[PDB]
A paper describes a structure:
Proteasomes are present in eukaryotes, archaea and Actinobacteria, including the human pathogen Mycobacterium tuberculosis, where proteasomal degradation supports persistence inside the host. In mycobacteria and other members of Actinobacteria, prokaryotic ubiquitin-like protein (Pup) serves as a degradation tag post-translationally conjugated to target proteins for their recruitment to the mycobacterial proteasome ATPase (Mpa). The bacterial 20S proteasome interacts with a ring-shaped AAA regulatory complex called the mycobacterial proteasome ATPase (Mpa) in mycobacteria or ARC (ATPase forming ring-shaped complexes) in other actinobacterial species. Here, we use single-particle cryo-electron microscopy to determine the structure of Mpa in complex with the 20S core particle at an early stage of pupylated substrate recruitment, shedding light on the mechanism of substrate translocation.
The cryo-EM structures of the Mpa–20S CP complex reveal the architecture of a co-axially aligned AAA-protease assembly featuring a substrate conduit from the entrance pores of the slightly tilted Mpa tandem OB domains to the AAA motor and into the α-ring of the 20S CP. Interestingly, our structure reveals that the β-grasp domains of Mpa contribute a second contact in the form of the β-hairpin loop between strands 16 and 17, which interacts with the N-terminal H0 helices that form the gate of the CP. In state A, Mpa protomer 6 (cyan) depicts the β-hairpin conformation that is the farthest away from the gate pore in the outward position, while protomer 1 (blue) displays the most inward position right above the pore of the CP gate. These positions are slightly offset in state B. Interestingly, while in state A, all six of the canonical aromatic pore loops of the ATPase domain are in close proximity to the substrate backbone with one of them (protomer 6, cyan) initially disengaged, in state B only five protomers are in close proximity to the substrate backbone and engaged in interactions with it. The loop of the penultimate protomer (protomer 6, cyan), which was at the bottom of the staircase in state A, is retracted away from the substrate in state B and has shifted upward by 25 Å to a more distal position relative to the proteasome gate. Furthermore, in state B, the five pore loops contacting the substrate are shifted downwards by 2–3 Å compared to state A, which results in a translocation of the substrate towards the open gate of the proteasome by almost one amino acid. In state B in comparison, all protomers of Mpa are resolved with ATP bound, including protomer 6 (cyan) with its pore loop now in a disengaged and retracted conformation. Nevertheless, protomer 6 still exhibits less contacts to protomer 5, and the arginine finger that it contributes to protomer 5 does not contact the nucleotide, thereby creating a fissure in the ATPase ring between these protomers.
Numbering used by the authors:
A (entry chain C): 489 to 587, 603 to 609
B (entry chain d), D (entry chain f), E (entry chain 8), F (entry chain 6), G (entry chain 0): 8 to 190, 203 to 234
C (entry chain b): 301 to 523
Write the structure that this text describes.
């Protein structure tokens, strides 16, 4: 639930607009891409420092670095995910965002 | 269309509250403490409403100052029509709820505002401070310890959740409130109290060098 | 009825008697005619009891209302003006015998010299007002006797205390020469009421001090 | 979209202010100085509002003159209802903000105007000049040194930022203001001051040969 | 198509009543008993209407409180215009029957409220308690034994159907009502009675320690 | 365009009246007899209008009770303005026709209602009972023997067509009317008469045990 | 597109002014001279407004006569409310500008009119004649020498540009004005002057044989 795994912000009309994390979108292809990125990071590490091993830190960093390259999910999911997000919330999704001169706000 | 027309207005109101400064109100030994992040020296977000009833708000100013004025009007008309000790924080909170609901389902644009009405006991009397939060829906919630309004409320609300202590003195509650608000000097803070020890008018601002000493 | 107000070096004092009559009949032995309308003013009202108490109440409400809307009290000038407009508003009823005249004491925080920031303001039935400069004022049926007493006693006023003593004495002489003004009742223990305003605001004088002053005066007169 | 419509309104108001002359107001030793680029001899963009409160505007003449008139009305009604020393530049600025927040959201066309309300201290008194700028949206900004309105504000603002000096005399502040405004003779300038030294009415125009000598 | 709009109005009102807490009202030996599930200490869903006429509601707070206020207004104006014993629960029910119909057909959104008007006999008099239910349709149902309003009404209505007993004492009817309502402590219950034994004003709240003893 | 709205207005009004109870009114020796199928004990579909003029209705209750009230208002204002014997069933019927036509053409929804106005002669006078039926559009029809309103009118109207007998006593007309209405006990019948023999107020309800004896 | 919609409202007004006759006003030794091409004998396009203030117009007769009347109304109400010498051509011009702007933005169709307000000095006084031109939108322009309104303004404006001479007598200015207008006899010309030498009312028509002699 930590804000370190933020994936999308859904602008629910009724307010309390909800933050969808990576857990809400962990598809199998996303998991394979994450493990491949971790493997690439391990390869870079073994080429940089020499030691032949795979670190848990590689996986931990791939967790946060997977979103650096979008997996075609943000703003482009099927209406099934939007429907489920709305059904759980009970409100229509006005807009989704990735994570002036209009009056005065105090 | 029923909910669809209403919900669209709600999204705009929630967005406006998010683009605004944060205010906190918490109970302490001498009453209630309002601490707001406010750069201007003229425009305010904390106000006396009646003898023992205070008021804080966050969101479009032309709107929550309109409510500030309406509430002052109401409270004084009641106090004169009946008596001063008859106006209570509860009535005021209820009027704000009715009024924010009526704006939500009739006016063109919903008031992007969030209100907190506070009340303390009378002089030489004993009773716990009451905090109410009124949202743009017309919803009203009874808070036992503290209210956080405007901006990102989660980190401030959690920091207060760890630091809060009932019967904290004025200085401790000020430290806790500024600390949780950071999650700022006297030139960027608006601080006032509902001092339960005052004989009649309980609201009292803490500015300048006195504020400097307290923090 | 009789309400005196006098400046002293550094502040203002305002005292009022306690009797309320109907014709020759003594109907109230403990009415309070001097109110604290705000942290720096006090208002006495002579005249019809209803109109008086209502004036005081509504004026206090209005001062505080503007203070809450604007975030700053009116200047002493604005306060004077609002009170004057109320008084002018009661003029028709005053011609119908519902007259109420206010005497307004205040401490101007914005004045240049603190030692002379005290202010006394008197009103007529037609709303005109006047800022007193000879250092003292009074209103009510005993006002003439009170003023003629303070004219002689006023050289003795040098601070808050002596000013209070002189106030109480002036009341004693008002009552001494007029029957509608009640003097200190030693039997029931009812004494004039007094308010003191200085740099720190307005406070009610606690009854004991007025009691001691009254008993000093009474022991002085009887020899 | 609802957001798109508000952005379109903002663009229309910005275009009108951009299609106009430039005005500057800056603090100097004797008070506040208004210097506007104005060719006409009858139509004016600088005006007295109350004893110590001045007013400058940039945009559509009929509208900011409508606001000029409304402000005059307001200030005099207050001054008479309470007293002259009770009307402050701060109240006036606030009223203009509420009015430009109501016009922008309720009327058909937003007012394409930029306002600056100025205030100085009373006679024999000491206090820093206050400048407020009210935008067409209804926002108010507290300015410490100078306000630039209408036309290409950024080049003029950049020059004032380099040339400004607190406690500059009337002639120096006039040279600085005309210079930064150029980034024009007495036949194309409207110049007035809020002279803090005057006993009551502080506003005073500088025209003709006296203006000629000053510049 | 007014039919499509009317069909969606009815669904919207039904959803709002379902999206709310549950209230029950039942007849017992001493009159009528209202038991509502209510967490707040300030906001109430049970009210005195007139000397012997009580009122419970379920739906949107601001709206059924609007109706509460209107009904109080009506009843007092009648009682003063004619006499106290002329205002009856039947008249009140009928007025809320017609006001909810007018609202349901004429206002933008139908009120999402469900009402129950209760009446008992006068002091030293004998007569059966009368319960009426007024829906958002404006339909008025005469109930002989109990009314259930708001939320899911089926399980509560059935549990009451098995447990109900005429002439049950106050404690038994309270146990039955709380039990069927569960299908909650003194900090989450609003309990009041229309005690037929009182001389004039029959409505009487049961809160705190007395409520604690009863349940 | 108006005629297409009228076609929609015809069906909606007709369907609503069909969704209601059946009422009959027939002439008998002592005047006119109203027999309605009515389960409620508080809500009534038969009413006194004036001294000798009665009224029955079938449709949405709120709308024909609105008409009931309007008619009472009218009749009393006339009777006081002129005299009691000047108000006639014919005037009343005509007013209802005008009002239902205006409603049917001008209001959003047509009153789904069907009216029957009945009149008998004055005391010691001789004259045949008059029945008028006013339909939702404003049409008015003069009936010599009986009127049937609401629900399925064909079988009841035919059964009455075979059973009707002029100068039938009160008991026979009650049997005929209940029989044809069946095509129900005292707990589901609303029965009243316009008794031509009463001195002034002819309308008289027959309820409870007296009704029990009659049927 | 708001700008394009304004362009349509601007083109329609411009088309109306072109679909008409031409008027000129120019300064000469004795004041100001109005020369209009006007065939009718009853309908006039030049008028007195106040003692020293004259008025000419071009466009749609009913509308600029509406403005003529409004201006007369204004000027007399001011002159009576304050004094005659307080009404100036500048005030009048400003009022026409405000009014034509309000009409141009708020009414259905913009006033296809073009106005010229003229003023001369008082008797025995010395001051240059002032000419203002007010266009359909509200724009106002200060003219030093001459104004040309309606029809094709380019050739007339240029011919005047070559022929104009300050301090030309009445006959020379008439020849120049008729000549540049041709770019017509006493039966097709409306000629009037604002003669600065008159004691009070400066406006004076030149018609018939006197006009015949002058031209």
């Amino acid at each position: 639930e930590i804000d370190d795994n933020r994936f999308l912000e859904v602008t629910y009309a009724n307010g309390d607009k909800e933050v969808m994390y990576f857990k809400d979108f962990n598809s199998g292809a996303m998991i394979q891409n994450v493990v491949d990125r971790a493997k690439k990071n391990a390869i870079k590490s073994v080429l940089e420092t020499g030691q032949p091993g795979l670190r848990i830190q590689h996986l931990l960093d791939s967790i946060v670095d997977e979103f650096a390259e979008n997996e075609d999910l943000p703003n482009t999911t099927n209406p099934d995910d939007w429907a489920r997000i709305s059904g759980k919330k009970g409100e229509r999704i006005v807009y989704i965002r990735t994570l002036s001169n209009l009056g005065q706000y105090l | 269309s029923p909910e669809q027309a209403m919900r669209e207005r709600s999204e705009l109101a929630r967005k406006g509250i998010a683009r605004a400064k944060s205010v906190v109100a918490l109970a302490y030994a001498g009453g209630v403490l309002f601490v707001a992040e406010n750069p201007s020296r003229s425009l305010q977000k904390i106000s006396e409403l009646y003898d023992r009833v205070g008021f804080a708000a966050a969101g479009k100013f032309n709107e929550f100052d309109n409510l500030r004025r309406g509430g002052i009007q109401f409270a004084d008309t009641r106090g004169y029509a009946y008596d001063r000790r008859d106006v209570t924080g509860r009535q005021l909170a209820n009027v704000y709820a009715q009024t924010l609901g009526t704006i939500f389902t009739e006016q063109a644009k919903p008031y992007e505002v969030e209100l907190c009405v506070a009340e303390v006991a009378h002089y030489g009397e004993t009773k716990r401070p009451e905090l109410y939060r009124i949202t743009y829906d017309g919803s009203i919630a009874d808070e036992p310890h503290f209210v956080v309004m405007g901006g990102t409320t989660e980190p401030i609300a959690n920091a207060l959740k760890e630091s809060y202590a009932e019967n904290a003195s004025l200085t401790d509650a000020l430290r806790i409130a500024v600390a949780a608000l950071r999650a700022l000097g006297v030139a960027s803070l608006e601080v006032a109290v509902l001092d339960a020890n005052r004989p009649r008018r309980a609201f009292r601002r803490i500015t300048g060098s006195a504020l400097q000493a307290l923090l | 009825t009789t309400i005196v107000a006098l400046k002293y070096p550094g502040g203002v004092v305002m005292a009022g008697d306690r009797r309320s009559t109907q014709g020759n009949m003594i109907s109230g032995r403990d009415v309070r005619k001097v109110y604290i309308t705000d942290d720096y003013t006090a208002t006495g009202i002579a005249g019809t009891a209803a109109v008086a108490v209502e004036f005081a109440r509504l004026y206090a409400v209005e001062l505080e209302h503007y203070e809450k809307l604007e975030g700053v009290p009116l200047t002493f000038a604005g306060k004077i003006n609002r009170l004057a407009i109320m008084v002018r508003g009661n003029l028709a009823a005053a011609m119908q015998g519902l007259l109420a005249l206010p005497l307004l004491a205040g401490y101007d925080i914005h004045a240049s010299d603190p030692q002379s920031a005290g202010r006394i303001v008197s009103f007529d039935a037609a709303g005109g007002w006047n800022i007193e400069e000879e250092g003292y004022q009074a209103v009510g049926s005993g006002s003439l006797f009170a003023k003629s007493s303070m004219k002689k006693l006023y050289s003795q006023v040098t601070d808050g205390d002596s000013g209070l003593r002189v106030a109480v004495e002036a009341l004693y002489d008002a009552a001494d020469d007029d029957s509608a003004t009640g003097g200190p009742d030693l039997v029931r223990g009812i004494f004039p009421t007094a308010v003191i305003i200085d740099a720190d605001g307005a406070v009610d004088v606690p009854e004991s001090r007025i009691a001691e002053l009254a008993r000093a005066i009474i022991e002085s007169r009887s020899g």
